[PDB]
Amino acid sequence: QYYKGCSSKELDELRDTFFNDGLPSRIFTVLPFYPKLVNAFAKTLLQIFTKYDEPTEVFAGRILDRILETDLDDPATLSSLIHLFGIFLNEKYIYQKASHLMQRFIEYLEKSLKPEHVNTPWFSKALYVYEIILAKSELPHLEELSKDVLLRYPLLSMAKVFRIPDPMKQKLFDILIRVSDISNFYSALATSRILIFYSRDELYANNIARSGILSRLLKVIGSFQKLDKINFLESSFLLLTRRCFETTENVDALIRAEINRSFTAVRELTTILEEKAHVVMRSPSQFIDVLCETARFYSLKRFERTGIMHLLLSQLMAASEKDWLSEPANQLDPSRNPVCAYMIFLLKLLVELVSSYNQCKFEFLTFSRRNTYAERPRPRTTAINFFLYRLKHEAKRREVIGMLARSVIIGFLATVQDDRTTKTDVKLADPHMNFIRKFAIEAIIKAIRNATSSSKLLESNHLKLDMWFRIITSMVYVQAPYLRQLLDSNKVEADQYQLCKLVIDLGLPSVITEAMASIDLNYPFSKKIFNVAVEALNTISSTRNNFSEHFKIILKSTVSRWKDIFDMFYDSKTYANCIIPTVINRLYKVSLALQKDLENKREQEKLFAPLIDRAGIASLMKSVFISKPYIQREIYHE
């Protein structure tokens, strides 16, 4: 039709002609112009080199040589080449034989990568490639056993991964940390992704926290609040901050509790490792130690200020000043207003951090607007007061922000779920927890007392008084919107009791009545204020009754965030067998004989006080003079 012939001989002739003269050698001069097609390019190129069986690692080395020759003044071509190299390295076949290529690329990154290139496009791509390496260089060491008897002679084997030299890793971390102001969204996302890996070590997390890179990432996320990809950066920053606040003892307790829960819920080691892969990733050494301490014997028997909190709180207060209620030009969606979405993200992060870690609570307590530094920071009411006072679409946004603030305060009052075990009614609260609870209760008491004094203050802040009564109701139940989701019920009763006790010990119920009686019952809002105050009193009384013996928007827990981190880089769940050898080298190597020997030895051997004061009773009976529907009276009867 068009050529000399159409038999497959002609097809092979044309294929050879194109391969010897065509795109296979012309890629470097056509690729930069079409970055969006880079992935496609890879595929096509692979196919070509798959037909002629030519080695692919050699072409990857050619790409790396072009990268090295390429100067830093041509960002487009360098970025495209680096992206193509990363795409090639992603395929496992090239990965198994690219070790020299990976080492050369790491050396080139050390030589060339500088913090001043953060805004350049290729920078981000470089980090991506580095991730492809680092993600595999951080895998647990695949050891070998030679002193144990195995029921199945062979074992699962995986291709040896490439381990970055430690000094190179440290140098790359130092280069990354010094990154100046960031203006490219993708560069910030890649930096956050890399820091997620780098923060697994406590010292690296401390360095990240002291560096202030989190402030630059926060600025980037705030600036690009209108981008559709901003959610990825939100999640990455949340995970990075959570890792930054984690400490060795906290992670150890979390993994111990998770292992105990898994045992309670004789299993097989493979299933346990696959199910709890993220736990292993968080700290393989500690997980192995805990498992060895617990289990014996593939079945196994049942046997210090940081500044992140200050940055987040200051950003929240600064954002609150700007108009976060007006809708944009051109159905309900609070996230439509960029300021509202920014503050929603800030409040979600604050809820998670304060409800998760004790140091978050401590830094929330001792916040200062001027960031005054002291050897021992002293408690301040700035954050608590800001949350209490400051915080149709406008009504929806206000309601959402109020729910988030209530969650923040309630979580601040709750106790961190560390070393979670069987619910224990210890009835003895940690001194720090009770101290912070007392501080918050006193702050709320002072706010209520001030608000109701004088008619002008009541007219001004009756809504704030209603919100405070709602809060004091919620805190006794220690439950708030998407807040109880992150509290372990094993310890929420102690919070549901100690807190209530504190309330009584602080004469809070009496304060409620005095505030209740301070209104004239002529304002239209008096009904709502009375209803909420009576609800708070009812909650306090009911909680007191439950413990009569003693008297007379998606949020996830820490382990869920660990699972998210695992899914971000190891989305297969089977990168857990790599730690089977060492476990066998620790438990099944010796306890197989020692424990079974013990079994053989055993076989051979066989062979109230007034809640309210006097005046408070009259303050309550004042409720009789308000005409209410019967549906609003049952609370009074109760």
Q: Is 5 exposed, middle or buried (0-12, 13-18, 19+ CB in 10 A)?
A: exposed
Which residues have C-beta within 8 Å of that of residue 631, sequence separation ≥ 6? Answer: none
Q: Please, are residues 442 and 508 in contact by the beta-carbon 8 Å criterion?
A: no
Burial 548-581 (b: 16+ CB within 10 A, else e): eeeeeeebebbbebbbbbbebbbeeeebbbbbbb
Nearest one of 202, 300, 298, 297 to 259, comparing CA atoms? 300
CA distances from 320 to 316, 342, 344, 412, 605 (A): 6, 10, 11, 20, 74
Judged by DSSP in three states, 253 sits in helix
> Resolution, rounded to a tenth of an Å?
2.8
Maximum Cα interatomic distance, the chain, rounded to a whole number of Å: 110
CA distances from 236 to 170, 186, 440 (A): 22, 12, 31
CA 624 to chain centre: 50
Q: What CA dihedral angle connects 484, 485, 489 and 493, to 10 degrees?
A: 0
Q: In whole angstroms, what is the distance from residue 142 CA to residue 284 CA?
A: 12
DSSP code of 572? T
Query: What is the residue-wise DSSP string for 524-552?
Result: TTHHHHHHHHHHHHHHHHHHHHHTTTT--
Query: What is the residue-wise DSSP string for 475-518?
Result: HHHT--TTTGGGS-HHHHHHHHHHHHHHHHHTTHHHHHHHHHHT
The one-letter amino acid code at 500 reads: C
Q: How was this structure determined?
A: cryo-EM
DSSP code of 573? S
Which residues partner with 267 through β-bridges? Answer: 300
Q: In whole angstroms, what is the distance from residue 422 CA to residue 257 CA?
A: 10
CA 49 to chain centre: 42
Angle at 217 between CA 204 and CA 484, to 5 degrees: 80
Report long-range pairs for 225-230 (Cβ below 8 Å, ≥24 apart). Answer: 225/338, 225/339, 225/341, 225/342, 226/338, 227/185, 229/185, 229/189, 230/185
Q: How many CB atoms lie within 10 A of CB 37?
A: 14
CA atoms 445, 451, 454, 459: torsion sign: negative
Q: How many CA atoms lie within 13 Å of 88's alpha carbon, on the beta-carbon side?
A: 29
Judged by DSSP in three states, 447 sits in helix
Token pair in block for residue 301: 């028997």
Q: In whole angstroms, what is the distance from residue 503 CA to residue 413 CA?
A: 12
**Helix, strand, coil % over all residues of the chain, rounded to 5:** 70, 0, 30
Q: How many CB atoms lie within 10 A of CB 593?
A: 12
CA atoms 574, 575, 581, 584: torsion sign: negative
**Residue 516 φ/ψ, nearest 5 degrees:** -65, -40
Q: In whole angstroms, what is the distance from residue 296 CA to residue 598 CA?
A: 12
| Residue given tokens 């010796």 in the structure block | 590
